[PDB]
């Protein structure tokens, strides 16, 4: 976020306004930010306090951590140099989509940034048109006619991709409205294979 602020500041006529700083400073009080991060299936609540000296005091559950660091670039890779409770470490930082990737010689960790509901398309999912081909591959077998009653777990089609057999299975107990592919056809990845009657 601080880097984004600097990028915006670069193009402004006022380049030295104190507002362009990322201090998060307040008058006679300290700013505490409530951040939420998802590790696996667990939501982690982090209370971050912006200190005057430029460091950060982070509280997770009952433990407090003193955090300070900066971003530096080696080649084309951005690196994060940080110190947590006096322990210093370096790691490669990549933020793609809503996932934070941290690469360190100890290991690699992925942290997910929660996506606000409003931004998520509301009513995102209406119906499923059969399992999508696991990959681009030839259709080797079709087990369903144009109108056939199927139950969940009923194999619909068999596909071979790079010499690896996958069997498509019925998602619902709905009768099959139509079939988009026949045997010997090459089906592209994530293309609808079966149409199911609306219920």
């Amino acid at each position: 976020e601080k880097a984004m602020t600097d990028t915006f500041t670069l193009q402004a006529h006022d380049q030295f306004s104190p507002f362009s700083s990322s201090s998060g400073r307040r008058l006679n009080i300290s700013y505490t930010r409530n951040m939420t991060l998802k590790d696996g299936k667990n939501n982690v609540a982090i209370a971050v306090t912006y200190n005057h000296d430029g460091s950060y005091s982070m509280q997770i559950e009952d433990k407090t951590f003193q955090v300070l660091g900066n971003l530096y670039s080696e080649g084309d890779c951005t690196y994060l140099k940080c110190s947590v409770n006096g322990v210093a470490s370096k790691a490669k930082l990549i933020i793609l989509e809503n996932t934070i990737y941290l690469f360190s010689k100890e290991g690699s960790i992925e942290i997910d940034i929660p996506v606000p509901k409003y931004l998520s398309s509301v009513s995102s999912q209406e119906t499923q048109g059969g399992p999508l081909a696991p990959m681009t591959g030839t259709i080797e077998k079709v087990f369903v006619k144009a109108g056939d009653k199927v139950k969940a777990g009923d194999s619909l089609m068999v596909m071979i991709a790079m010499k690896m057999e996958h069997t498509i299975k019925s998602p619902k107990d709905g009768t099959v409205k139509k079939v988009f592919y026949r045997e010997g056809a090459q089906a592209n990845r994530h293309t609808p294979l079966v149409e199911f009657e609306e219920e």
Binding site: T5, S21, L27, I29, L119
Partner: protein, 532 residues
């Protein structure tokens, strides 16, 4: 060639001196008191009210402001102490409203948010005054206004102090309409149930955002169901008052940020700019340098040296009227003309100040006033009649100036000296006071003496006898009243003097204030008759 070496102001204070230690101790105590009081005020309306507000699914006003502004951007809150002990038994933390200046989508905007936890968002007179002051600041600096409307309308008791007069509630709508007409964007976010007074605010706003269920706009409340009379769905679909539909608080804030981006506004500066440099001395030494006793005098040049870029100062007319300090400096790269007090004002000081103000107005340079007016214990009269002829010159020159003006009260401010050094009545863009400041018409002892003399002469003319005990009885209440009314918290409780600021944060506050004030273009200055 901007290289030329230049002498720097300021000197290293003597830390070992006992006077420095005592002043530092007193200032530290004052600052700690201020910080703890601000913390308690920030706590909010109360525990039960906060619990109910959270249970209704809404966000606390400070959380709303934090989510609205850009990540990590500083927030300049205004008048945090409004309503502090203003009313005898009712507690109004922060005046019931929150106002400040922050950056939204890279644009500096004025934010006004009602605190629903304080008397259900009802408007006390101090709340109306605070909102009017914020609106006036935004209009003067051409800052977009964002309203987070959650209020119960005017406080039914004390209606006489809120409804009728010119500076009462209707001035809010008047200012809204005027600023809308002047191309200053108005955005209203109905984050909770409004009322008759609250309802008009979204109507006059250019853009409205109303939450699906919490938001309810009715010109008159039920006292028909609240949702049916006024609701997000109804206003969005049938009445058409609402302009955007928001699922909850976070969605409303996101929509507000988007609406600001599409404002199509670019900030442009008229004054020249230079790279910013930090002062050469630590700011915390101001505690020892200034202390808490107004009787002692300190050189304002130290304060100037600890708050200007690189501690570089170009004094103007140094040896003429030395009780007044004037010169040119730069704060965060903006040019500024500093006018400070170093003692009693004289004719030479007034003339020098008038000359400097004329120069600054001609060159279109912002002005900064540092007020430390002195008590009359040292000089009873000093033929003050001479001062009157020349004090006015400064008063007029200051009033007619059109450049951005910011006043900071670092010490006493009494008598016509307050008017001369850009008092609150002369419309500075911002006004701040340090925790040790004192403001009043005159010192209490001086006032008591004046009253006693008047009574004795009248009694003598009547032939009645003025008893010595009677004189003492008259003097004691006056001294107590003046001391009480001169407290910085007394002045901050009323919307005078905006808010109190820690001296260590003076440079940051001034930088933020000047950056905000530079949004508006600088107009030409027209002066009245100079009684040369």
């Amino acid at each position: 060639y901007h290289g030329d070496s230049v002498a720097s102001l300021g000197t290293q204070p003597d830390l070992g001196s006992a006077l420095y230690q005592e002043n530092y101790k007193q200032m530290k105590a004052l600052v700690n008191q201020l910080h703890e009081r601000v913390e308690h005020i920030k706590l909010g309306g109360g525990e039960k009210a906060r619990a109910l507000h959270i249970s209704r699914g809404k966000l606390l006003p400070r959380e709303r402001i934090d989510n609205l502004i850009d990540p990590g951007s500083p927030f300049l809150e205004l008048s945090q102490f409004a309503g502090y002990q203003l009313y005898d038994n009712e507690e109004v933390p922060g005046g019931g409203i929150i106002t400040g200046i922050g950056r939204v989508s890279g644009v500096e905007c004025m934010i006004i948010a009602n605190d629903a936890t304080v008397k259900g968002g009802a408007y006390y007179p101090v709340t109306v005054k605070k909102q009017l002051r914020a609106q006036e600041i935004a209009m003067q600096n051409r800052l977009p206004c964002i309203y987070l409307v959650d209020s119960g309308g005017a406080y039914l008791p004390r209606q006489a102090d809120v409804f009728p007069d010119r500076d009462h509630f209707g001035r809010t709508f008047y200012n809204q309409a005027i600023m809308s007409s002047k191309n200053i964007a108005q955005i209203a976010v109905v984050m909770g149930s409004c009322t008759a007074g609250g309802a008009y605010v979204p109507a006059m706003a250019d853009e409205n955002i109303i939450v699906r269920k919490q938001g309810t706009i009715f010109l008159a409340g039920p006292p028909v169901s609240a949702e049916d009379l006024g609701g997000a769905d109804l206003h969005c679909r049938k009445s058409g008052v609402s302009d955007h539909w928001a699922l909850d608080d976070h969605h409303a804030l996101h929509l507000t940020r988007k609406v600001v981006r599409n404002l199509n506004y670019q900030k442009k500066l008229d004054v020249t700019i230079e790279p910013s440099e930090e002062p050469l001395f630590p700011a915390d030494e101001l505690y020892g340098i200034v202390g808490a006793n107004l009787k002692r005098s300190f050189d304002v040049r130290e304060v100037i040296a600890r708050i200007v870029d690189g501690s570089r100062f170009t004094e103007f007319k140094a040896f003429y009227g030395d009780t007044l300090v004037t010169g040119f400096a730069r704060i965060f790269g903006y040019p500024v003309g500093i006018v400070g007090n170093n003692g009693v004002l004289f004719s030479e000081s007034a003339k020098k100040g008038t000359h400097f103000v004329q120069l600054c107005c001609q060159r279109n340079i912002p002005l900064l006033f540092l007020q430390n007016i002195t008590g009359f214990m040292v000089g009873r009269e000093y033929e003050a009649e001479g001062i009157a002829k020349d004090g006015a010159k400064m008063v007029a020159a200051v009033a007619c100036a059109q450049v951005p003006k910011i006043t900071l009260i670092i010490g006493g401010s009494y008598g016509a000296g307050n008017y001369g050094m850009c008092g609150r009545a002369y419309s500075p863009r911002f006004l701040y006071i340090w925790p040790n400041a004192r403001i009043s018409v005159m010192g209490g002892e001086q006032a008591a003496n004046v009253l006693a003399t008047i009574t004795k002469d009248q009694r003598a003319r009547e032939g009645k006898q003025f008893s010595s005990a009677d004189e003492a009885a008259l003097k004691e209440p006056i001294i107590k009243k003046f001391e009480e009314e001169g407290n910085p918290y007394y002045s901050s409780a009323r919307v005078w003097d905006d808010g109190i600021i820690d001296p260590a944060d003076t440079r940051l506050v001034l930088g933020l204030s000047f950056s905000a004030a530079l949004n508006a273009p600088i107009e030409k200055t027209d002066f009245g008759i100079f009684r040369m």
